[PDB]
Design a protein around this ligand. Structure first.
Ligand SMILES: [Mg+2]
Ligand SMILES: [Zn+2]
Ligand SMILES: [Zn+2]
Lengths: 57, 229, 63, 108, 393, 337, 45, 64, 146, 244
RNA sequence: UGCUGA
DNA sequence: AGGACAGCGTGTCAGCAATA
C-alpha cells in the first residue's frame, strides 16, 4: 500500500482493490518498476537498460 | 518418555556402527567401492554406508517415535504398552540382510511422511519467495554506488555496506592472500597489469587512513564520552 | 509398464493400448507370482546387466 | 581417391610439419588403436595419440609430433606399412597353421 | 464482480475474475506470456561437447530459424542456405523482402530456391530466416526456476539423428537436472541485441559461482571424482604409451604442441605417476602467454582414511608434512594430494576455483572439460569402477 | 632388482599393472624400434579345435591392440548377405508385418558375400550383381484325412508352422548358373518364422543385400569372436596332504591335477588353460599364499563361431584381409598427395 | 558491484532458493514467514 | 509371443531349438540338461529359452 | 653436477602406517653424516628391505660432464655415458626448503622436500651440505644398492 | 526400470564392438552406473543379479519372496554358493576386457541377469517445439498444448531470473517480439487508446473525442494492454495515457 | 473432474 | 474504549482424455 506504482501492487495480489484505489485517487504511474515496464512493453530500468547510446552525428 | 527412550537405543547403535563400519568391512577404503564413493564426495554418505551395513536406526516420524493405536499398541504384532525398543521403531536390521515386516511398516511410514512433507514444504516456499521477489525487485545499484528503488528512494548508501558484490569477494578474505602473493605475477599480467598499478593515485584515501589511525591512537577506548568541557 | 495387456485384439477398440512384443518370465520371482498366474500376461525381459562405469553417458540415473 | 572418406591433415599452429593432426574418416578405435601402436615403435616420434571426436560422427584424429627433422608424415606412412606387413605375416602364418592342422586331423 | 452478488445463479465470472487471480490476466498473459521460437525436449548426458555447449538433435535445428539480414560479407553463406533448402541442415525456410515479405522457400523443387538464391542484394535488405548454424546462442531453462543460474546461454552444437537436447554434466547442479525424464526448454534469441547479452551476460561460464554465497556451482560429479581420486593417489604408474593416449585423450588438443613431462622413475623402467598425467594436462590447457599457477590446499579425503595398520610414533616426523591430504600444485605441476571433490567439484578454493580467479571463466570451463575427458578415458581404458556385494559385506 | 617380463600378476583386491613393457624406450637396453624379424620369429599360431562353426587358435606373441583389431573386425567389418526389404502381398497371420520383416532380417543366408557387391545408394531395383530374392508363400488348411483328434500336426495342419524350409530362391538373373541348385539357401531349415491357423496365409518377397555387422547386427557373421589371455598358475609351495584336494576344488577341475608321488598326495598344475578366473582360492585364507595366478603377457586364445554363412577359418582370413585393406586404402590415399 | 546490478532480485532469490529446496523455538519456513511476510507483534515463541 | 530368432546379447541363433527344447523336456530331462544338450553354453543364450513364454499359442485360439 | 652424495641404510620400512599399493616409504639414516632421509620408492620395480644399504646421489644433470639438461626426454639420446652406475634413477623438483625449528640454538639444519611426480623425499641435515638446493629446482635422485 | 525402483532414461546405444566383453565371450546388453546404489540402498538388485545368473546357469528358478532368508541363512551366501557351484565366483564378479583398448580392466566387474520393464513414457509423446501458430484471439498470444503448434508459458517466476542477469533486451525481445507486440494509435493530445478513428475508404486517423486528425501518432504496445484498456472501460473507468 | 511426468 | 468478530488471503512445474 505504501508503494508508488499502481501497475505494480496490482500485478501482486488483490488487484481489484488496488485498481479501485488507484482509480478513485487518480493515481499516476511513472513506468519505472519492472512490472510497469513489462506491462506497457518497455525495457526494464536496470541491468542492461540503464543508459542511452547516443550515436553522434 | 519418547525422548528419554530414543537414548538407550542410541547408545547401542553407536556401539553398533563402530563395531562394523570403520574396520569390520571385508574390503577397506583404498579398495572398497562404496567407501571411496561416499568418502571422495562422489555420491552418498557414511549414514548411507551404514543403514546398508550393521544398522538401519531409530525411526522418527514427527520428531517422535511411531504413534500408538487407541489401545496402547504400536502395531498389531506388539503387546499393548510394550517396553522393547523394537516396538517403538528401533530397526536393527540392515538393507544387506533385509528388514522384517514390522520394521518394514515403520520404515514405510517414515518414507511416506517424507514425501508428504516435501509436497507441502514446496507449496509454502513458492508463496514466500513470490512475495519477497514481488517487493525487492526494483532495487538496483546506481551510478553513484547507492542502492535506490524505482522512485529514487535511497535504501542503502552502499550496497553491502561496502559495495563489493558477493562472487568477487571470495579471495579478498584473509587466508587467501598467501595465494594472491604466490600467483602475483600471473594476477598482474592476466588482469590489472602494470598499467593500472601505475595509473593509481592513493594520496587522498591514504591520508584519511593516517588520520583515522592517529585518532584511534589517541583514543584507545572509543566509548569514553569525549568533550571539550 | 509396457507389457502384454490382454489376449483379445481385434475386439477391444480402446483408445491407447501398449504392447510388448516378446515378454519373458522373470527367472527370479516371488512364489505368489505363480499363484496368480501372471505369466499369462508378462511385463518385461531378462537382460544381462553389468554394474560398471564405462561410458560417460550412464551417469546420474541414465542407462 | 576419395576426397574425404579418407585423409584431411591439419598442420598445427605455424603449420609445423613436425606436428600434424590427421583426420581419418569412417574409422573407429580398431584402426586408430592398431595404427597408434604401430607408430609408437618409431624412435623418431615424440608424441602419438588418437581420439574419436564424437560418438555420433565416424572419424578419428591422429596427432603425430615427431622430432626436429622428419615431417611427421613419414612416421604415419611407415606405421601404415609396418601394420600391413604384420597383417600379411599373420595371415600367412595362420593359413599355414590351419592347413597343417587339417592335414594332421584328416590323416588320423 | 461475479461474487458481489451471492443470491443469483447463471452467474458467469465478472471482470474481477478476468483480472484478479493466479489464472487471472496479470499472472497470465501479462507476466507469463507464451513465446515463439522455443523448443522443449528430454535432456540427455553428453560429456563430449564443451561445457558451454548444448547438443541440438537436427529436428529443432531444421525448424528453429534465426532471421539474419543479407549483406556483402554474408551473401555467400546465405546463398548456400537458400540453395540447401528448408529441409537440408545449413538451409533456410524463408526470405523476407525489402518492402514486401515472406516468400517461403519450403518448396522442394530445388529450382525456385535457386531462382531466389540470386536477387539477394539484387531499402532494408532481404532477411534470410536461416536455421541454427552450430555456433548460435540458446537460452536453456529447467522449470522450477529458483535462482539466476537456472537460465544460462549455450552454444548450439548440432547433433544428427536424435530428439533429445544433450547437455554437459558440469551444468547439472546449476539446473538440478537428473536424466530420468527431465524436459527442458530452449529459447532462440532473434534480435542480435539479445545475442550480445546471451554471449556477455547470460553465458554459462560467467555463471560459475552461485550468487547466494559466491561458492562455485559448476563442477564434475560421480565417476569423474572416483576416477581422479584413484589416479592421483600415490601408487599409480603409467608406461609411456598409457601416459600418452591418456594426455591426448583428455586434451584432444587442436592448437599447438602438447607439452609433456619427464618420467618420475627413469631407471629400472621409465614410468610416470598419474599426478604427472594431470600435471601435463594442466600445463597445456592454461593459456600460452599466461604462466602456470601455484596452489596450496587440502583434500576431501582425510589423511586418516589411508591408515591401515596402527600408526607408530616416529620421533621427528610431522606426519602431515608429507601426506596425501595436502594438495600442493607448484607451477602447474601437482606435487602432492589426491584431488578429490575438494577440487574438480562444487567446493570453493580448489584447483578450478583458483583457475577461474587467476585466468577467467573460460579457462575454468576448459579445465573442467579436459579433466572430465581424462578421467573418463582412465576408467574406460585401463581401470574399471563397479560396486559389487563384497564391498558392502 | 627383479624383472617379470611375461605375466600380468593379480591378487584379489585388484590387478597390479596394465603395461607390457615391450615398446620403444621401455627399458635400459630393452628398447624397441619395431624389429620386424624379431616379430616374425616370436610369432606363432596354434589352431586347437576346428569343428564346423568353431575355431580356437592361440595367436601367441602379438599385442593387445592388434588382437583387439582382429576381434572387432570379425564382429563388425567382415561382410555378409541378409534380408533388407520385404514386399508383403498378403498377410493374414497373427504376426505383424513389421515384426515379420524384422524376424526375416535376422535369418542367416548361405550365399557367400564375396561373389556379390554393395547396392549403390538408391538402387531400389537391384540386379544379379548385388541382390538375392527369396519367396515365402504358405497357407494353412485343415487336413481332410483326420479323425476327431487334437494334435495340431495331425489336424488343422497343412502348414501350421512356417519354417525356413518354406522359403524358395527365385534366381534373379543368370544366377541359376554360377550358383548350383542347393548353394543359395537359408543356413537353417528349422527356424520357426510364424504360426498359422486354417484360412491364414503368408505371401512375401524378401530381398537380401550385402553389408557389414557395423551398420546392423543382422549382417554380422559370427556369434562371438572374443579372445582371452592365457592364464598362468604357479605353486609357490608343494601342496600336499588333503590340502591338495581343497586346492583342486578352488579351480576349474582339470587345472590342478593331484598326483600321488609318494604315500602322500601332491597337487600339480596340469593344464593352466582350462582355468576360468573365479578367484575362489582367495576365499581359502590359507592357500591364497601358496598359489600365484596371473596372465601370460602376449599369449592369447581366440574363439570364433560363425552363424553358418562362411567357415570360421575363412572368417579369420577375411578379417585379416579387411585390416590389410584399411591400411592399404589409407596408404594409397596418402600417396594421392 | 557494477552499476545496474539489480541486487534486490538477487537477495530475494538467495533467500528463496535455499528454503524452497533446503529445542523450544520455531524453525523452517514458519519462522521465515513470521519474520518477513507477516512482521507479527505476536510470535509463537 | 514367438521364439526370438537370435539371442539378443551374442546373436547366436536360438530360433531352431524351441521344438527340440520342448521335445527333450517331454522326454524326462531337466531344463539344465536340456539346455546343455542343445548347445547353449553361455547363460545369455540359456536365458533366451529358459524364460521364453510362448504366447503365440494363446493368440492362435481366437476366431479367424 | 652433484648436489649431494652419501651411503644410507634402511632403518624403517613404513612407520606412519599409511600404506599405498606399489610405493613404500623408507626411513633411512646416513652414515658418517647422520643425515636423515624419507624416501618414497616404487617397490614393484625396485624391491627394498630393512637393514639394506645403498649409495644415494642427488644431481642436477645426468651427464657428469658439465653440460646442462634441456628439460626434454629423448629415449634416443646418443650421449650414453650419463650416470648408469645406478640401478634406480628418479627425476623430480624441490618444492620446499625450511630451516629447522630450533631458535636460540645453532639449529642451522635444513629439510629439503623433493617431489618425484608423486613420490616425496625429505633430506634433513647440516645446512653446510644442502646449499645446492633451491625451491623449484629440478634434480635427479640416483640410487644403487650395495 | 528394474523391479526395485531404479528408473532411468536410455542415454546411448553403445555399439556392440565397443562394449566390455567378458572372459567367457559374453557382452552385456545393459550398462548400469554403480552410483545409484550408495544413496538409494537397493540391495535387492545386487541379489537379483546373482539369483538370475545362477538361474540362467543351472536352469532353475529361484524365489524372491520377502522374509525367507534370515541373517543366519543369508541370500548372498546362498546365491554365491550357487554361483561357485557353476564355476563362477562367489561374489558374482567376472572380469571383463575393454572393448575399446582391448586390455583386461584392473577391476573385476559385477555382472548378472536382471528383469527390466519398459515404461510407457517415451520422448515421442513428450516433445514440443513451437515457432508461430494459433494466436489466442483474446490476447494475440501463442495457443499452447502440443496437438497444435503449442507454445511454452514463460511464467512469472522466469522473467525475474532473466532480469537478474541484467539482460533487459533479451527479456524485451522475448516478450514483446515473440508474444503480443502490437502497433496501436493514440490521441496524443488526449492520451486515449480508444479515440483514434479510420475513415470509410485517404484513410487518415481522426480523434472522435476531439475533432483533430493530425494529433494521432503510433505507439508500440501489447494486445493484452489494449485488452486491459477495453476491460477497464467495460466499467466506466478511464485509462488516460501520456504519449511522448 | 480423474490421471500422469519432473 | 474493553472487546466480537467477518473477512479477505495466497498455494512449483509442464502433458493427456473430455467435456462444460
Ligand atoms: Mg528427475
Ligand atoms: Zn547368447
Ligand atoms: Zn481526443
Amino acid at each position: 500500500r505504501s508503494n508508488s506504482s499502481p501497475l505494480q501492487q496490482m500485478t501482486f495480489e488483490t488487484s481489484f482493490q488496488f485498481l479501485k484505489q488507484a482509480t478513485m485517487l487518480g493515481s499516476h504511474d511513472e513506468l519505472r518498476s519492472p512490472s510497469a515496464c513489462l506491462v506497457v512493453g518497455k525495457v526494464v530500468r536496470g541491468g542492461t537498460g540503464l543508459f542511452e547510446l547516443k550515436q553522434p552525428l | 518418555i519418547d525422548l528419554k527412550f530414543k537414548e538407550e537405543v542410541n547408545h547401542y547403535s553407536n556401539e553398533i556402527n563402530k563395531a562394523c563400519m570403520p574396520f569390520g568391512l571385508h574390503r577397506q577404503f583404498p579398495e572398497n567401492s562404496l567407501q571411496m564413493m561416499v568418502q571422495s564426495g562422489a555420491k552418498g554418505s557414511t549414514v548411507n554406508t551404514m543403514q546398508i551395513s550393521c544398522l538401519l536406526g531409530q525411526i522418527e516420524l514427527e520428531g517422535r517415535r511411531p504413534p500408538l493405536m487407541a489401545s496402547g499398541k504400536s502395531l498389531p504384532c506388539f503387546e499393548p504398552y510394550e517396553f522393547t525398543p523394537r516396538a517403538g521403531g528401533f530397526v536393527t536390521g540392515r538393507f544387506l540382510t533385509g528388514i522384517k515386516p514390522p520394521e518394514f511398516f515403520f520404515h514405510c511410514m517414515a518414507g511416506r511422511e517424507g514425501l508428504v512433507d516435501t509436497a507441502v514444504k514446496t507449496s509454502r516456499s513458492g508463496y514466500l519467495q513470490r512475495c519477497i521477489i514481488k517487493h525487492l525487485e526494483g532495487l538496483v545499484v546506481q551510478y553513484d554506488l547507492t542502492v535506490r528503488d524505482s522512485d529514487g528512494s535511497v535504501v542503502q548508501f552502499l550496497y553491502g555496506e561496502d559495495g563489493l558484490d558477493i562472487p568477487k569477494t571470495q579471495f579478498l578474505q584473509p587466508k587467501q592472500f598467501p595465494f594472491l602473493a604466490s600467483n602475483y605475477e600471473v594476477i598482474m599480467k592476466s588482469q590489472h597489469l602494470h598499467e593500472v598499478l601505475s595509473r593509481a593515485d592513493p594520496k587522498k584515501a591514504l591520508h584519511h587512513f593516517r588520520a583515522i589511525k592517529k585518532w584511534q591512537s589517541k583514543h584507545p577506548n572509543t566509548l569514553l564520552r569525549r568533550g571539550a568541557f | 509398464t509396457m507389457g502384454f495387456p490382454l489376449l483379445t485384439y481385434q475386439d477391444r477398440s480402446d483408445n491407447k493400448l501398449y504392447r510388448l512384443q516378446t515378454p519373458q518370465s522373470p527367472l527370479v520371482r516371488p512364489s505368489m507370482y505363480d499363484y496368480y498366474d501372471m505369466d499369462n500376461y508378462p511385463i518385461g525381459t531378462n537382460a544381462i546387466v553389468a554394474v560398471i562405469s564405462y561410458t560417460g553417458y550412464d551417469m546420474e540415473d541414465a542407462m | 581417391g576419395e576426397r574425404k572418406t579418407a585423409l584431411e591433415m591439419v598442420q598445427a599452429a605455424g603449420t609445423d610439419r613436425h606436428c600434424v593432426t590427421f583426420v581419418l574418416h569412417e574409422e573407429d578405435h580398431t584402426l586408430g588403436n592398431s595404427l597408434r601402436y604401430m607408430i609408437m615403435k618409431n624412435p623418431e616420434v615424440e608424441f602419438c595419440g588418437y581420439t574419436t571426436t564424437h560418438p555420433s560422427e565416424s572419424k578419428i584424429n591422429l596427432r603425430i609430433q615427431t622430432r626436429g627433422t622428419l615431417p611427421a608424415v613419414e612416421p604415419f606412412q611407415r606405421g601404415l606399412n609396418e601394420l600391413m606387413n604384420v597383417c600379411q605375416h599373420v595371415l600367412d602364418k595362420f593359413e599355414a597353421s590351419i592347413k597343417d592342422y587339417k592335414d594332421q586331423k584328416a590323416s588320423r | 464482480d461475479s461474487e458481489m452478488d451471492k443470491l443469483m445463479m447463471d452467474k458467469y465470472p465478472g471482470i474481477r475474475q478476468i483480472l484478479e487471480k493466479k489464472e487471472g490476466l496479470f499472472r497470465k498473459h501479462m507476466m507469463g506470456k507464451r513465446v515463439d521460437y522455443a523448443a522443449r525436449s528430454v535432456i540427455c548426458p553428453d560429456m563430449y561437447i564443451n561445457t558451454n555447449e548444448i547438443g541440438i538433435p537436427m529436428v529443432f535445428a531444421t525448424k528453429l530459424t534465426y532471421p539474419q539480414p543479407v549483406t556483402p560479407w554474408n551473401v555467400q553463406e546465405l546463398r548456400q542456405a537458400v540453395i540447401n533448402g528448408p529441409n537440408v541442415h545449413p538451409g533456410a525456410s524463408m526470405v523476407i523482402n525489402e518492402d514486401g515479405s515472406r516468400t517461403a522457400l519450403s518448396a522442394v523443387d530445388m529450382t525456385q530456391r535457386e531462382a531466389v538464391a540470386k536477387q539477394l542484394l539484387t531499402q532494408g535488405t532481404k532477411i534470410v530466416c536461416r536455421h541454427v548454424k552450430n555456433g548460435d546462442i540458446l537460452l536453456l531453462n529447467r522449470q522450477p526456476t529458483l535462482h539466476r543460474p537456472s537460465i544460462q546461454a549455450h552454444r548450439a552444437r548440432i547433433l544428427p539423428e536424435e530428439k533429445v537436447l544433450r547437455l554437459h554434466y558440469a551444468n547439472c547442479k546449476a539446473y538440478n537436472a537428473d536424466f530420468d525424464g527431465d524436459e527442458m526448454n530452449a529459447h532462440f534469441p532473434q534480435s542480435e541485441l539479445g545475442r550480445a547479452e546471451a554471449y556477455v551476460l547470460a553465458c554459462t561460464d560467467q555463471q560459475y559461482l552461485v550468487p547466494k554465497d559466491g561458492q562455485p556451482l559448476a563442477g564434475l560429479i560421480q565417476d569423474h571424482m572416483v576416477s581422479g581420486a584413484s589416479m592421483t593417489t600415490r601408487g599409480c604408474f603409467f608406461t609411456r604409451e598409457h601416459y600418452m593416449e591418456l594426455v591426448y585423450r583428455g586434451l584432444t588438443d587442436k592448437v599447438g604442441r602438447v607439452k609433456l613431462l619427464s618420467p618420475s622413475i627413469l631407471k629400472p623402467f621409465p614410468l610416470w605417476t598419474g599426478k604427472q598425467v594431470v600435471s601435463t594436462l594442466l600445463i597445456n590447457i592454461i593459456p600460452e602467454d599466461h604462466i602456470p599457477l601455484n596452489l596450496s590446499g587440502k583434500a576431501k579425503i582425510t589423511g586418516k582414511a589411508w591408515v591401515k595398520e596402527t600408526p607408530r610414533s616416529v620421533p621427528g616426523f610431522n606426519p602431515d608434512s608429507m601426506c596425501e591430504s595436502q594438495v600442493i600444485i607448484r607451477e602447474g605441476e601437482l606435487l602432492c594430494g589426491v584431488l578429490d571433490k575438494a577440487h574438480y567439484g562444487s567446493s570453493a578454493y580448489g584447483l578450478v576455483h583458483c583457475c577461474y580467479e587467476i585466468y577467467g571463466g573460460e579457462t575454468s570451463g576448459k579445465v573442467l572439460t579436459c579433466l572430465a575427458r581424462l578421467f573418463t578415458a582412465y576408467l574406460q581404458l585401463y581401470r574399471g569402477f563397479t560396486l559389487g556385494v563384497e564391498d558392502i559385506l | 632388482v627383479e624383472e617379470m617380463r611375461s605375466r600380468v600378476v593379480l591378487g584379489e583386491f585388484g590387478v597390479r599393472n596394465v603395461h607390457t613393457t615391450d615398446f620403444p624406450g621401455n627399458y635400459s637396453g630393452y628398447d624397441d624400434a619395431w624389429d620386424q624379424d624379431r616379430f616374425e620369429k616370436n610369432f606363432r599360431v596354434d589352431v586347437v579345435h576346428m569343428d564346423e562353426n568353431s575355431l580356437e587358435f592361440d595367436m601367441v606373441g602379438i599385442d593387445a591392440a592388434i588382437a583387439n583389431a582382429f576381434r572387432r573386425i570379425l564382429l563388425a567389418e567382415v561382410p555378409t548377405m541378409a534380408v533388407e526389404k520385404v514386399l508383403v502381398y498378403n498377410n493374414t497371420s497373427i504376426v505383424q508385418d513389421e515384426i515379420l520383416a524384422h524376424r526375416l532380417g535376422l535369418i542367416p543366408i548361405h550365399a557367400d558375400p564375396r561373389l556379390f557387391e554393395y547396392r549403390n545408394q538408391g538402387d531400389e531395383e537391384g540386379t544379379e550383381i548385388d541382390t538375392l530374392q527369396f519367396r515365402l508363400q504358405v497357407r494353412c488348411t485343415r487336413n481332410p484325412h483326420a479323425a476327431k483328434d487334437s494334435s495340431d500336426p495331425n489336424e488343422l495342419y497343412v502348414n501350421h508352422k512356417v519354417y525356413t524350409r518354406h522359403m524358395t530362391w527365385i534366381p534373379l538373373g543368370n544366377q541359376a548358373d554360377l550358383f548350383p541348385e542347393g548353394t543359395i539357401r537359408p543356413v537353417h531349415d528349422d527356424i520357426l518364422i510364424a504360426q498359422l491357423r486354417p484360412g491364414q496365409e503368408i505371401d512375401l518377397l524378401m530381398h537380401c543385400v550385402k553389408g557389414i555387422g557395423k551398420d546392423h547386427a543382422k549382417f554380422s557373421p559370427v556369434a562371438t569372436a572374443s579372445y582371452r589371455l592365457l592364464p598362468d598358475i604357479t605353486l609357490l609351495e608343494p601342496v600336499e596332504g588333503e590340502a591338495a584336494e581343497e586346492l583342486s576344488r578352488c579351480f576349474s577341475p582339470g587345472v590342478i591335477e593331484v598326483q600321488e608321488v609318494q604315500g602322500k598326495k601332491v597337487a600339480r598344475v596340469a593344464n593352466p588353460r582350462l582355468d576360468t578366473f573365479s578367484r575362489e582360492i582367495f576365499r581359502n585364507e590359507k592357500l591364497k599364499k601358496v598359489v600365484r595366478l596371473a596372465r601370460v603377457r602376449d599369449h592369447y586364445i581366440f574363439s570364433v563361431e560363425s552363424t553358418g554363412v562362411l567357415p570360421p577359418d575363412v572368417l579369420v582370413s577375411e578379417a585379416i584381409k579387411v585390416l590389410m585393406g584399411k591400411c592399404r586404402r589409407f596408404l594409397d590415399e596418402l600417396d594421392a598427395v | 558491484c557494477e552499476p545496474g546490478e539489480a541486487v534486490g532480485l538477487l537477495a530475494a532469490q538467495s533467500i528463496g532458493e535455499p528454503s524452497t529446496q533446503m529445542m523450544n523455538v520455531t524453525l523452517g519456513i514458519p519462522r521465515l514467514r513470521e519474520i518477513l511476510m507477516v512482521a507479527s507483534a505476536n510470535i509463537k515463541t | 509371443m514367438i521364439i526370438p530368432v537370435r539371442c539378443f546379447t551374442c546373436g547366436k541363433i536360438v530360433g531352431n531349438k524351441w521344438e527340440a527344447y520342448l521335445g527333450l523336456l517331454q522326454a524326462e530331462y531337466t531344463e539344465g540338461d536340456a539346455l546343455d544338450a542343445l548347445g547353449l553354453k553361455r547363460y545369455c543364450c540359456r536365458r533366451m529359452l529358459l524364460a521364453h513364454v510362448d504366447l503365440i499359442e494363446k493368440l492362435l485360439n481366437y476366431a479367424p | 653436477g652433484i648436489l649431494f652424495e652419501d651411503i644410507f641404510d634402511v632403518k624403517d620400512i613404513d612407520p606412519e602406517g599409511k600404506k599405498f599399493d606399489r610405493v613404500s616409504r623408507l626411513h633411512c639414516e646416513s652414515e658418517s653424516f647422520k643425515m636423515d632421509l624419507i624416501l618414497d620408492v616404487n617397490i614393484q620395480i625396485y624391491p627394498v628391505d630393512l637393514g639394506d644399504k645403498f649409495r644415494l646421489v642427488i644431481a642436477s644433470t645426468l651427464y657428469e660432464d658439465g653440460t646442462l639438461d634441456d628439460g626434454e626426454y629423448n629415449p634416443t639420446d646418443d650421449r650414453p655415458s650419463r650416470a648408469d652406475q645406478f640401478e634406480y634413477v628418479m627425476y623430480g623438483k624441490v618444492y620446499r626448503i625450511e630451516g629447522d625449528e630450533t631458535s636460540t640454538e645453532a639449529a642451522t639444519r635444513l629439510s629439503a622436500y623433493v617431489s618425484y611426480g608423486g613420490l616425496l623425499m625429505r633430506l634433513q641435515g647440516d645446512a653446510n651440505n644442502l646449499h645446492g638446493f633451491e625451491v623449484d629446482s629440478r634434480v635427479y635422485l640416483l640410487m644403487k644398492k650395495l | 526400470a528394474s523391479r526395485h525402483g531404479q528408473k532411468g532414461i536410455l542415454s546411448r546405444l553403445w555399439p556392440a564392438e565397443d562394449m566390455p566383453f567378458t572372459e567367457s565371450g559374453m557382452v552385456p546388453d545393459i550398462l548400469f552406473n554403480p552410483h545409484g546404489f550408495p544413496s538409494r540402498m537397493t540391495i535387492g538388485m545386487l541379489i537379483e543379479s546373482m539369483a538370475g545368473k545362477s538361474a540362467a546357469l543351472h536352469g532353475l528358478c529361484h524365489d524372491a519372496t520377502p522374509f525367507i532368508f534370515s541373517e543366519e541363512n543369508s541370500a548372498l551366501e546362498y546365491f554365491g554358493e550357487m554361483l561357485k557351484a557353476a564355476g563362477y565366483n562367489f561374489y558374482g564378479t567376472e572380469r571383463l576386457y575393454s572393448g575399446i583398448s582391448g586390455l583386461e580392466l584392473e577391476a573385476d566387474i559385477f555382472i548378472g541377469v536382471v528383469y527390466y520393464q519398459r515404461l510407457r513414457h517415451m520422448v515421442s509423446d513428450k516433445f514440443q517445439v513451437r515457432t508461430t501458430g494459433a494466436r489466442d484471439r483474446v490476447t494475440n498470444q501463442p495457443i499452447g498444448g502440443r496437438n497444435v503448434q503449442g507454445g511454452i508459458r514463460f511464467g512469472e517466476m522466469e522473467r525475474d531470473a532473466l532480469l537478474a542477469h541484467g539482460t533487459s533486451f533479451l527479456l524485451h525481445d522475448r516478450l514483446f517480439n515473440c508474444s503480443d507486440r502490437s502497433v496501436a494509435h493514440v490521441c496524443v493530445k488526449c492520451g486515449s487508446l480508444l479515440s483514434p478513428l479510420l475513415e470509410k475508404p485517404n484513410r487518415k486517423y481522426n480523434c472522435t473525442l476531439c475533432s483533430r486528425s493530425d494529433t494521432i501518432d503510433t505507439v508500440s504496445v501489447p494486445y493484452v494492454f489494449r485488452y486491459f484498456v477495453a476491460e477497464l472501460a467495460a466499467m466506466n473507468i478511464k485509462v488516460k495515457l501520456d504519449v511522448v
